[PDB]
Amino acid sequence: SHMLEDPCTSKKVRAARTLLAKNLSFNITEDELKEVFEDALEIRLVSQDGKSKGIAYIEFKSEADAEKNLEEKQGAEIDGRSVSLYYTGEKGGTRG
């Protein structure tokens, strides 16, 4: 419990190396997201209550990875639409 410095439970620190991909398409998929980032641990998908909406989660190995990729690409113009990058280490907010 002593640790050196991390009185936040390391809960909101994991989302720092992860970001949400948006503006995707009904054709793109984790593959295109994994092919666009090619620098994260893995990407997740996200649609409506039950219908592809074009959203996907993305967790990199570190904030610099999710950030360098989210910025180095940001959109990457794919499926006729650039995949939007929505971080989640200090921006999103959903009391849950």
UniProtKB/Swiss-Prot annotation:
Q: How is it modified after translation?
A: Some glutamate residues are glycylated by TTLL8. This modification occurs exclusively on glutamate residues and results in a glycine chain on the gamma-carboxyl group. Symmetrically methylated by PRMT5.
Q: PTM N6-acetyllysine: list the residues.
A: 22, 51, 68, 91
Where the record annotates domain RRM, the positions are 17-90
| UniProt-annotated location(s) | Nucleus, Nucleolus; Cytoplasm
Q: Which residues carry this modification: Phosphoserine?
A: 25, 82, 84
Q: Which domain of life is it from?
A: Eukaryota
| Modified sites of kind Phosphothreonine | 29
What biological function has been recorded for the protein in this entry? Nucleolin is the major nucleolar protein of growing eukaryotic cells. It is found associated with intranucleolar chromatin and pre-ribosomal particles. It induces chromatin decondensation by binding to histone H1. It is thought to play a role in pre-rRNA transcription and ribosome assembly. May play a role in the process of transcriptional elongation. Binds RNA oligonucleotides with 5'-UUAGGG-3' repeats more tightly than the telomeric single-stranded DNA 5'-TTAGGG-3' repeats.
Assembly and binders? Identified in a IGF2BP1-dependent mRNP granule complex containing untranslated mRNAs. Component of the SWAP complex that consists of NPM1, NCL/nucleolin, PARP1 and SWAP70. Component of a complex which is at least composed of HTATSF1/Tat-SF1, the P-TEFb complex components CDK9 and CCNT1, RNA polymerase II, SUPT5H, and NCL/nucleolin. Interacts with AICDA. Interacts with APTX. Interacts with C1QBP. Interacts with ERBB4. Interacts (via C-terminus) with FMR1 isoform 6 (via N-terminus). Interacts with GZF1; this interaction is important for nucleolar localization of GZF1. Interacts with NSUN2.
Listed name of the protein = Nucleolin
Q: Species name for this entry?
A: Mesocricetus auratus
